[PDB]
Structure formats: C-alpha cells, structure tokens
Design a protein around this nucleic acid. Structure first.
Ligand code: DCP
Ligand code: CA
Ligand code: CA
Length: 325
DNA sequence: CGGCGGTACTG
DNA sequence: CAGTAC
DNA sequence: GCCG
C-alpha cells in the first residue's frame, strides 16, 4: 500500500538520526510526515501535491521532491558520525539519549567499552546483557507462546480472567518487538490481587528472568520485565503486563494496541474536542486555573468498547490493523 | 512564534 | 527531579 | 520537523 517506499525509507534514516540525538520534536514532525507519506493513495508526483498533505510542509516537501527526482538525499551524506554510536548506545534498554551522549562524550565507542568502563543502572545492565535478544523482533508465533504462558498462569487462579496480547501483535504484524499482555475480568472485582500471584507463579516456572519495572508494594497495574520460553536455544524477550479493572478495559486495550503515534494523534484530537484520553478513561477536559494549568481530571465518560471511544470522539472506527501508524 | 499525549517507575 | 519507558 |  506504501506507494512512496523509496522516499519514506530515506526519510526514516534522517528521522532516526534526529531521534538518537535528542531532537525529539523534530523527530516527531518527521514521524507524522512519514506516516502521512505511507498512507497517501498515490506516489507523490509534485511539490504542490506533497504540501497539500497534512503533516508535510515546505521543508519536508523539498526533501520528498529531492529524493523523487534525484533518487538520493544529500543530507544523509552529512549526518554526524556520532549517530551510529549514539544509536548503538540507545539500543540498550534503560539508556536513552542523555545517557548515550554522556557515554559518547566519555569516549565510549562500542558495547565493549560500555561493558568494561561505563556506569550502568540495573535496568541498563539487564539491557546490555540481552542486547542482541532484545534487538531481534520475535516471530508472532513465539509471541503467541509467551501470551499463552501468561494466560495459562493467570486463568489458573481464575478461569474467567480475560487475557489479550496487544501492541504490534494485536495490530497483526508478522514480527513483534516484545510481548504486550493485558489482563482483566468482566466480573469487575476479581482482577484485584492477581498481580502478585501471577508474577510469583511465572517466577517459580522459571519463565520470568529479570524485572525492569514492578512496584509490588502497591496492591499496581504495570509490570515490565524479561521472560524466556522453555526449550533449547530460546532467546530472552521483553514482556509487559498490565492488569486493569473492567470499566477501563476498552481504554486500556486501545492504549496498549497503539500504535504510539496513533495514540498521540488520537489524544491530540480528543484534546481539541474539549476532552482528554488516557489508558484509564476517555473524559471531559481537564480542570484548569485562570492560568492554563491543570489542577484536576475531567469527568469520565464511560466506554464499554473501543468503538465507544471512537464514537465519542466523532471518529470512524478502525480495526487494530488500521492503527498501525 | 510556542506547543507538540497522557501516564508511570527508578534512583 | 531528570531520565526513561509504555 | 509541522501546525495554528
Ligand atoms: N511512546 C509510547 C510507546 C508505546 N505506547 C503504547 C502503544 C503501543 O502499541 C503499546 C506497546 O508499546 P510497544 O513498545 O511494545 O510498541 P509496539 O508493540 O506497538 O511495537 P513493537 O512490536 O516494536 O513492540 O504501548 C504509547 O502509547 N506511547
Ligand atoms: Ca510490543
Ligand atoms: Ca511493550
């Protein structure tokens, strides 16, 4: 469906360069531009046509036409030499751009330098230890196996527990970066307490190997960690689990499915219509002072299904595969 | 030009 | 609070 | 980077 693949391919490189350098807004504009380019019903044939597309302005149109007519993008040949290294360091889970810059500034140029000389948080050490595993997208069959491991451990405490793999898996992609499992109960009550029990059950199976984010003191809806399927040669994989009350399930699912750019656009649109959208609920506009500052949430508008959220936002419903932005 | 999603942990 | 993540 |  992407009729501008040669253009978007080269735009994404520049976008990634801006991203690993910490120019997050520039990268955002690029992301919206590239998404708009991939959804266009036709290969772009002129500057004027490109400019008429939302998300694309003069500066982006210049590059689009440059790639269209020459087949190349000169700016790519002028990208800083630090960028491949900053990208290398950014590929470590737990390490972002500030950290990458700092490491580069300290002279580090390889994962080996990071291993032997760099100061690493617990999360960064886990990310470094499983660098290759976490960087490799898994086949969705493996994601299925992981999801059903979690589901099997969950429904053992309560067979009525609903478990849905979200993220790229739910959007139907052939490969997944990590497994995203949402859990709830139509009951409305028996979703409570299952967090500790599920985590313990998965730990005793030897399924969970590392924890990145899990605040267990709190009787907590989110877990970020690492798992590995039983059997020889199995890779470590990133696993994220959310447990939500049924009344929020639709917004949770929607959030979890994404994609992230889809979520940002949808929340922006909600904001323009005097509403607020989060993983918890679709609500009315947040409460503000004389100053523009927010001081309180808006009133929750009940949403049993994703379609209800689309409805209350005045949007045509889209299946998960149509949210793959 | 200023704003750019809404949220949550870790240390 | 800065950084990072979903 | 784009948009209003
Ligand atoms: N900045 C972000 C990152 C993620 N998400 C949400 C939407 C995503 O779909 C979901 C899962 O995040 P992932 O990092 O797992 O991204 P995907 O599953 O969509 O793709 P991938 O296969 O690369 O993991 O969380 C979001 O709202 N905002
Ligand atoms: Ca994922
Ligand atoms: Ca994830």
């Amino acid at each position: 469906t992407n009729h501008n693949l040669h253009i978007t391919e080269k735009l994404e490189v520049l976008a990634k360069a801006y991203s690993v350098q910490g120019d997050k807004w520039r990268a955002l504009g690029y992301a919206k531009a590239i998404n708009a380019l991939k959804s266009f019903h036709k290969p772009v044939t002129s500057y004027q046509e490109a400019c008429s597309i939302p998300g694309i302005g003069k500066r982006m149109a210049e590059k689009i036409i440059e790639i269209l007519e020459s087949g190349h993008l000169r700016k790519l040949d002028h990208i800083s030499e630090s960028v491949p290294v900053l990208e290398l360091f950014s590929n470590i889970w737990g390490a972002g751009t500030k950290t990458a810059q700092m490491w580069y500034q300290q002279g580090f140029r390889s994962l080996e330098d990071i291993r032997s000389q760099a100061s690493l948080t617990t999360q960064q050490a886990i990310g470094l230890k499983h660098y290759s595993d976490f960087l490799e997208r898994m086949p969705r069959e493996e994601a299925t196996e992981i999801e059903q491991t979690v589901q099997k451990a969950a429904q053992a405490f309560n067979s009525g527990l609903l478990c849905v793999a979200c993220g790229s898996y739910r959007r139907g992609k052939a490969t997944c970066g990590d497994v995203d499992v949402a859990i709830t109960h139509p009951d409305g009550r028996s979703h409570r307490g299952i967090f500790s029990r599920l985590l313990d059950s998965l730990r005793q199976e030897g399924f969970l190997t590392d924890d990145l984010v899990s605040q267990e003191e709190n009787g907590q809806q989110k877990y970020l960690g690492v798992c590995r399927l039983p059997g020889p040669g199995r890779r470590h994989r990133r696993l994220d689990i959310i447990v939500v009350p049924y009344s929020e399930f639709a917004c949770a699912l929607l959030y979890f499915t994404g994609s992230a750019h889809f979520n940002r656009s949808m929340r922006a649109l909600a904001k323009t219509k005097g509403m607020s959208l989060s993983e918890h609920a679709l609500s009315t506009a947040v409460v503000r002072n004389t100053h523009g500052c927010k001081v309180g949430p808006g009133r929750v508008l009940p949403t049993p299904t994703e379609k209800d959220v689309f409805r209350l936002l005045g949007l045509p419903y889209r299946e998960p595969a149509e949210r793959d932005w």
